[PDB]
Design an enzyme around this catalytic site. Structure first.
Site, PDB file in Angstrom:
ATOM      1  N   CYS A  65     -11.452  -8.421   1.820  1.00  0.00           N
ATOM      2  CA  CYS A  65     -11.457  -8.167   0.370  1.00  0.00           C
ATOM      3  C   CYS A  65     -12.507  -7.122  -0.058  1.00  0.00           C
ATOM      4  O   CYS A  65     -13.717  -7.320   0.119  1.00  0.00           O
ATOM      5  CB  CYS A  65     -11.721  -9.472  -0.415  1.00  0.00           C
ATOM      6  N   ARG A  68     -15.243  -7.925  -3.437  1.00  0.00           N
ATOM      7  CA  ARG A  68     -16.219  -9.032  -3.391  1.00  0.00           C
ATOM      8  C   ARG A  68     -17.522  -8.928  -4.211  1.00  0.00           C
ATOM      9  O   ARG A  68     -18.226  -9.909  -4.326  1.00  0.00           O
ATOM     10  CB  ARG A  68     -16.571  -9.382  -1.933  1.00  0.00           C
ATOM     11  N   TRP A 237      -7.974  -9.030 -10.282  1.00  0.00           N
ATOM     12  CA  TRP A 237      -7.097  -8.011 -10.824  1.00  0.00           C
ATOM     13  C   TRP A 237      -6.676  -7.107  -9.663  1.00  0.00           C
ATOM     14  O   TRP A 237      -7.260  -7.142  -8.573  1.00  0.00           O
ATOM     15  CB  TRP A 237      -7.784  -7.197 -11.919  1.00  0.00           C
ATOM     16  N   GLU A 242      -2.459  -1.181  -4.373  1.00  0.00           N
ATOM     17  CA  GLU A 242      -1.619  -2.298  -3.913  1.00  0.00           C
ATOM     18  C   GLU A 242      -0.223  -2.176  -4.509  1.00  0.00           C
ATOM     19  O   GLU A 242       0.795  -2.517  -3.871  1.00  0.00           O
ATOM     20  CB  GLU A 242      -2.220  -3.643  -4.344  1.00  0.00           C
TER      21      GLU A 242
END
Ligand code: HEM
Ligand code: HEM
Ligand code: JHT
Ligand code: JHT
Ligand code: H4B
Ligand code: H4B
Ligand code: CL
Ligand code: CL
Lengths: 362, 362
Positions: A65, A68, A237, A242
């Site tokens: 991720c 973070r 969000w 993506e």
């Protein structure tokens, strides 16, 4: 045998968690109570503080991720009290509304009762709480191919999609003791969607692309101190790539690049023209523009990487090792323009963390 | 001790190489001769066939190389006979001319005598045979920062660069028995360069960018059957992203993206505009266009990945394991638009292969 694994994980988690919360004095007595709780009952119950800090630690430890930096402001909703399918449904509806927050997305996790003896109390079938259906029969592809098997399982249960390219899948989950899951249509009033337009290219709306506002991943297991929360949907969000580089672009998803090339007025004939790359950039610019225009939170990959650099700096300053998966941290658009690309990351797994688990269907 | 490592590597290499050349019957007698050669002399000498096939195998086994489909057509020049610095210089000049081939680049390797007792016979200081100098003094950056330490070492030896952004470094190498390397200016008639223009955007020439035609990597060690060819410069042709996404784009190289953004008429103010990504695509389109316009071989990253897929298929059909480094095989522009991104690769090291070795300066 299980009591031992549990106790070991408990000791390691309680020590770390209370150290971080400045409660290190209370570790010894808390560990005492836990030891006795495990002996007598086979498990133990987290305090609300432990559960909240555990879910935050789990995000902080998610190697893949990039988002973070914001781990400590995760909004944790404790729904360990639910016992009925109506309560589960209402909690999932609530998570959607509160996380969405009229577009100003709040990173949120709703935590349902944990597995008992590996026995799930609630088993969520959705990959995300909001997701589009996919259909594939005899040459005809409609909607999101990534949703084909879940869509087919829903239609086995008497759900029927309208077969647009953007049908919202129902929430689908199973309660302990029921042979079959139940499903519930999402109230449209809860689901924000964003039409994709381009800042400069007026024809881009001809593609009639849209995406939903909030990705709420609902099929991962949260593990904290040996307790397995298999049902614990969470959201952040989106980072724009993506949607623009993967969901709308991948040949095995919506496969829109040839269509994008055409509306932006470039030929899609020669690899040396870099038309896929140009189309990717324009689609990604459109996605960021469209979300911003509508007041729905989103981050571009450069800003996301800049935030992640601060996460690395913060980890160092706190004396915590940083872990990360370089192959997932680099963005799929201009990766070498981010600092992430030019350094290495230790991909060790630290708990608390979020984990994949087997799908209940297919 | 060394004779053992050598003999072991020899056995493994000769068996594999002769099997591939259909000469498996000759393995036993060749191994016999090698065993006796090692005992009596401490080393052994490859036949021209072994050396040529070894260099090809080494390319085939280079995990980080996307260009491997063409491994078997490598042009191998055997210069194990050189003894003087004039012969080395002339061999390096020759490699440049023959590899360049008036723009129709031939992948080529020139192989110099190998290390004896870890003692180099020829030690090449250049990273590539054709490369630009870099200078950094008191706030002023000129040329290629990646060349700063080699440039400074050359100027210690009485070379002096003109301090343009594209000074060609001299060839620089040291012979066994000499305390200091010698250097030789490259004859400009041997070096093809390409001015960077854009197919659609006329102002792009205002940036006065150029790059050289042929990358000839000259600081890696070729290892074949336990023999260490520390001096063995080789070349392919460029994949365009090496020039456009890295050499001209990286902040720590020529750092041209802000300048590109300006000439293509976009603002470089907001991350959400994706101006770096757009500038990257236009610079990369310019690079491919410019090389093609001038008749100098180059490959775009999509075509390169399509060729690499055929390499994977060919490996499988031949019954050879494929090895690869996913982190280097993905291109730095639109990586998820290539098949490479969506699969995994075993990063095991197989010999023959090319290896890094310590720089002789700095
Ligand atoms: C606040 C905004 C957030 C952003 C922008 C963000 C961004 C991302 C991105 C881009 C990925 C890569 C996934 C992909 O490429 O498909 C990712 C992975 C992940 N994120 Fe985040 N994230 C955010 C919040 C969260 C939150 C709130 C959690 C949990 C509490 C979380 C946990 C994860 C996990 C577990 C993965 C890996 C999933 C897997 O292995 O498939 N993230 N994140
Ligand atoms: C024919 C055209 C060729 C193309 C297009 C090609 C392409 C590439 C590319 C893009 C890389 C990644 C390097 C970087 O990102 O800076 C690479 C790495 C490499 N290539 Fe190739 N290559 C070709 C020919 C060759 C040849 C002829 C050899 C040797 C005989 C070779 C050996 C290697 C090696 C050893 C690496 C890894 C270097 C390292 O670790 O730093 N390649 N290649
Ligand atoms: C079906 N499909 C494409 C799929 C299936 C399983 C897992 C994944 C990867 N999940 C990506 C993920 C997880 C958490 C996120 C949190 C925030 C955010 N912006 N993106 C996330 C993406 C994909
Ligand atoms: C200084 N610098 C940027 C650097 C230093 C050491 C190593 C490298 C990576 N070398 C990349 C490489 C190697 C062989 C190639 C063959 C063909 C080709 N088109 N590209 C290659 C790139 C960089
Ligand atoms: C350590 C880190 O993985 C490193 O920056 C790598 C990533 N992959 C790469 N890939 C290529 N082609 N070239 C590089 O210089 C690098 N650098
Ligand atoms: C196996 C292979 O590494 C795989 O395709 C990975 C690469 N990195 C990724 N990174 C992200 N963000 N999302 C993905 O789906 C993948 N897929
Ligand atoms: Cl998604
Ligand atoms: Cl280069």
């Amino acid at each position: 045998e299980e009591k031992e694994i549990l106790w070991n994980e408990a000791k390691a988690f309680i020590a770390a968690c209370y150290q971080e919360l400045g409660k290190a004095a209370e570790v010894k007595d808390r560990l005492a109570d836990i030891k006795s709780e495990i002996d007598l009952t086979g498990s133990y119950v987290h305090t609300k503080e432990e559960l909240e800090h555990g879910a935050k630690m789990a995000w902080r430890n998610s190697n893949r991720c990039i988002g973070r930096l914001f781990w400590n402001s995760l909004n944790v909703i404790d729904r360990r009290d639910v016992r009925t399918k109506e309560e589960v449904r209402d909690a999932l509806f609530h998570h959607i509304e509160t996380a969405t927050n009229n577009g100003k997305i709040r990173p949120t996790i709703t935590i349902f009762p944990p597995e008992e003896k590996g026995e799930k109390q609630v088993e969520i079938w959705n990959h995300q709480l909001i997701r589009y259906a996919g259909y594939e029969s005899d040459g005809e592809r409609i909607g999101d191919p990534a949703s084909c098997s879940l869509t087919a399982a829903c239609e086995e249960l008497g759900w029927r999609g309208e077969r647009t390219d953007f049908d919202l899948l129902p929430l689908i989950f199973r309660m302990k003791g029921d042979e079959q899951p139940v499903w519930y249509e999402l109230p449209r009033s809860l689901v924000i969607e964003v039409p994709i337009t381009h800042p400069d290219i007026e024809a881009f709306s001809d593609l009639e692309l849209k995406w939903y506002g909030v990705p709420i991943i609902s099929d991962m297991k949260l593990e904290v101190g040996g307790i397995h929360y298999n049902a614990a949907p969470f959201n952040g969000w989106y980072m724009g790539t993506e949607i623009g580089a993967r969901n709308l672009a991948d040949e095995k998803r919506y496969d829109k690049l040839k269509k994008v090339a055409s509306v932006i007025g470039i030929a899609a004939d020669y690899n040396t023209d870099l038309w896929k790359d140009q189309a990717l950039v324009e689609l990604n610019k459109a996605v960021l523009h469209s979300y911003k225009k509508q007041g729905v939170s989103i981050v571009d990959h450069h800003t996301a990487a800049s935030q992640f650099k601060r996460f690395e700096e913060q980890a160092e300053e706190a004396g915590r090792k940083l872990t990360g998966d370089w192959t997932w941290l680099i963005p799929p658009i201009s990766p070498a323009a981010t600092h992430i690309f030019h350094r290495s990351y230790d991909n060790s797994i630290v708990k608390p963390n979020y984990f994949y688990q087997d799908k209940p269907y297919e």
